[PDB]
From a paper:
The Very Low-Density Lipoprotein Receptor (VLDLR) is an entry receptor for the prototypic alphavirus Semliki Forest Virus (SFV). The mature alphavirus virion is approximately 70 nanometers in diameter and has T = 4 icosahedral symmetry. Trimers of E1-E2 heterodimers are organized into 80 trimeric spikes on the virion surface. The LBD is comprised of eight cysteine-rich complement-type repeats, also known as LA domains (LA1 to LA8), which contribute to binding with SFV.
However, the amount of VLDLR is much lower in vivo, leading to binding modes that might differ from the resolved states. The structure was resolved to 8.8 Å (bin4) using icosahedral symmetry. Furthermore, a block-based reconstruction algorithm was utilized to optimize the resolutions of 2’ symmetry axis region units to 3.41 Å. At this resolution, both the receptor distribution and binding interfaces can be identified. In this binding model, LA4 was situated between LA3 and LA5 and has no interaction with E1-DIII of site-2. However, due to the space limitation imposed by the binding of LA4, LA3, and LA5 can’t attach to neighboring two E1-DIIIs positioned counterclockwise. The result also suggests that the in vivo binding mode of VLDLR to SFV may differ from previously observed patterns. The structural analysis of the LA3-5-SFV complex at a lower stoichiometric ratio, along with the structure of the VLDLR-SFV complex confirms the LA binding models and unveils multiple states of VLDLR binding to the virus during the natural invasion of the host cells by the virus.
Author numbering:
A (entry chain I): 267 to 422
B (entry chain F): 1 to 438
C (entry chain G): 196 to 244
């Protein structure tokens, strides 16, 4: 039996673009060799072009009578690690683009809650400590007037 | 000296075990799973093959009537037709014009080559795993064949190894299996004695050599045409041929975890899942007395370049001070970085270099040379190449160290916000305590 | 590139130089034969046509 030609592979980001040139109907099939595989098989007849996904687990494709060939993707991305805070997020977004967003959102909400609580504590403390002297026509004690910014800057 | 460890069930992974006897020099063993084989347990149910309809010649009774007789043959059919006036090439025999009767007979039989081209229906349960492990250390190489269940101990150079049962219990074969030549199908075949015409298992034979046969193909006979002798009949086509045409998929091209299915016997090879516990028992001669090994003091580790790629893309340097030159047993005490070697030559110069493979942006692991220790931290840049033809040589751990750049930024920001909150709390408590002290 | 338009190129019709990139690879001959096997990606001009 004859062995068909090897296809031309072009590498992408977790993808392989694969150029197929048959002379007679050959069987092309591939599977992703992870926990849940991506199965497919076909009877390629004319000159076609296929794009097949290659996750970090890898995959194998079987073209004609040739032996199966395995390809593994590699942990590559586009961000810049160890840079400014807006580049580490890009780096960890190129990899795993579903948990980075969730973690960033969670941390941002925690920061906002903490800062709002702190600002609230300052406001409440000022209200408590500036109302006792604000029920009588008394002196604001310029020593205290300078330290805390109350409503009357200089008028009593 | 009893020792135990757990090694991944990944073919070709360079697992290295560190054995520390407090009275002797450390030892490093290299174990590697060259090959596996997951063999299930089968019980043959029946055998299917194409059928062959046997039609004996008709019996035409000239001037009389014939009576049908029943027989014990698979899917037997018999009928008698009245009023036939057959013909032959030279003239029409059975002189009686209309007082004739034809008897038609047909039955089904197993094909001629059913013992060469047949499909088997099995039941698979309680698979048993097997392996072929290569163990090297000291000056001993050699590969052995083991059963992976805690009931087979093999001796390699005076050391006893027991490979414990697999961590998981996952088998790609379902309860019912159909095997044809070199292909395994996860199929739900009908039970013996209840096949259906036109589909898989229309005729079922308990064994390839078994005499009994159960056939159900809706064979039917029809009245012959006038002036002919032919025994007409109608029959639903073979179920085996249509199963061949529309079986669909397989298990060879569908199995998870990237493992080959094979036949004779059925087994799923090199099928990466789970962990393999190991038990050892080493003699006193494998270790070296601490007096013989060199002494290592002042161990400092620095990282020249780091790159979290599949190959061994990191380089490490160790500085020390030694009294005499010899050998040491290097090891990395965290699975973040997987070293390449298990021995290194120490010399009076005070410099040695090692190669490691990692998959995290910022690793942090402790490396030991002979009896010394050192902590290494590094910053690693991603690789530029998109796809490679070899599997990963790291354990695939990606969470960075708590002293890395990202986690340092998180720590600094959280510390600033915590300082702000603590200041607010202290101010409010001071105000309330001033209110109370009055 | 092999297999597509212009896998072989020449400056002009009568030009002596030629650039060809067709992925021509030789294979080991079978035992007991004299046949110099090879494999090659088909013509790019025909598939362009
Ligand atoms: C030679 O040919 C003659 C026909 O010309 C055959 O005679 C036929 O014989 C059969 C039975 O031997 C007859 O069938 C039955 O006969 C009984 C007799 O009472 C009748 O009651 C039934 O209704 C039925 O017809 C048939 O009638 C008879 N035909 C005739 C007499 O014309 C003869 O059998 C042939 N020779 C041999 C050796 O068979
Ligand atoms: C322990 O034993 C195994 C098997 O004897 C050793 O592996 C063997 O290493 C040699 C040296 O590299 C290999 O020979 C060469 O292999 C290349 C591979 O392409 C080939 O092109 C050369 O012509 C030459 O044959 C040999 O193939 C290899 N065997 C296997 C089964 O992989 C291993 O190195 C030994 N360990 C130590 C520490 O010596």
């Amino acid at each position: 039996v004859p062995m068909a030609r090897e296809p031309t592979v072009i590498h992408g980001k977790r993808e392989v673009t694969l150029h197929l040139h048959p002379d007679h109907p050959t069987l092309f099939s591939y599977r992703t060799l992870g926990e849940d595989p991506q199965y497919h098989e076909e009877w390629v007849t004319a000159a076609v072009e296929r794009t097949i996904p290659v996750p970090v687990d890898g995959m194998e494709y079987h073209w004609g009578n040739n032996d199966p060939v395995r390809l593994w993707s590699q942990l590559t991305t586009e961000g810049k690690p160890h840079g400014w805070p807006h580049q580490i997020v890009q780096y960890y977004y190129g990899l795993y683009p579903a948990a980075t967003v969730s973690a960033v959102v969670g941390m941002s909400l925690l920061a906002l809650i903490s800062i709002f609580a702190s600002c609230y504590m300052l406001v409440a403390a000022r209200s408590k400590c500036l109302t006792p002297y604000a029920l009588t026509p008394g002196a604001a004690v310029p020593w205290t007037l300078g330290i805390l910014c109350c409503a009357p800057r200089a008028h009593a | 000296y009893e020792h135990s460890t757990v090694m991944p069930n990944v073919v070709g992974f360079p697992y290295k075990a560190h054995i520390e006897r407090p009275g002797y020099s450390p030892l490093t063993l290299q174990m590697q799973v060259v090959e596996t084989s997951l063999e299930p347990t089968l019980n043959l149910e029946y055998i299917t093959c194409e059928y062959k309809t046997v039609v004996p010649s008709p019996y035409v009774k000239c001037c009389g009537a014939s009576e049908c007789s029943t027989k014990e043959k698979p899917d037997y059919q018999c009928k008698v037709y009245t009023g036939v006036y057959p013909f032959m090439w030279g003239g029409a025999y059975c002189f009686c014009d209309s007082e004739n009767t034809q008897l038609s007979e047909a039955y089904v039989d197993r094909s001629d080559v059913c013992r060469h081209d047949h499909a088997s229906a099995y039941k698979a349960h309680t698979a048993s795993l097997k392996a072929k492990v290569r163990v090297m250390y000291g000056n001993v190489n050699q590969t052995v064949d083991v059963y992976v269940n805690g009931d087979h101990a093999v001796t390699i150079g005076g050391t006893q190894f027991i490979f414990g049962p697999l961590s998981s219990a996952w088998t790609p074969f379902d309860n019912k299996i159909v095997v044809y030549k070199d292909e395994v199908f996860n199929q739900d075949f009908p039970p013996y004695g209840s096949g259906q015409p036109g589909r898989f298992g229309d005729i079922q034979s308990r064994t390839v050599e078994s005499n009994d046969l159960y056939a159900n193909t809706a064979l039917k006979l029809a009245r012959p045409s006038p002036g002919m002798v032919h025994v007409p009949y109608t029959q639903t086509p073979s179920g085996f041929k249509y199963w061949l045409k529309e079986k669909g998929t397989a298990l060879n091209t569908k199995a998870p975890f990237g493992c080959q299915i094979k036949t004779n016997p059925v087994r799923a090879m090199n099928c990466a899942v789970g962990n393999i516990p190991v038990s050892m028992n080493l003699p006193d001669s494998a270790f070296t007395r601490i007096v013989e090994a060199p002494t290592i003091i002042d161990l400092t580790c620095t990282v020249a370049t780091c790159t979290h790629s599949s190959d061994f893309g990191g380089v490490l340097t160790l500085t020390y001070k030694t009294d005499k030159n010899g050998d040491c047993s290097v090891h990395s005490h965290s699975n973040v970085a997987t070293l390449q070697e298990a021995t290194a030559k120490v010399k009076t110069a005070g410099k040695v270099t090692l190669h490691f493979s990692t998959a995290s942006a910022s690793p942090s692991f402790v490396v030991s040379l002979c009896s010394a220790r050192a902590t290494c931290s590094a910053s690693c840049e991603p690789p530029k190449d998109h796809i490679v033809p070899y599997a990963a040589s790291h354990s695939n751990v990606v969470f960075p160290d708590m002293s890395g750049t990202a986690l340092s930024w998180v720590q600094k920001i959280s510390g600033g916000l915590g300082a702000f909150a603590i200041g607010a709390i202290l101010v409010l408590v001071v105000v309330t305590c001033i209110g109370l002290r009055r």
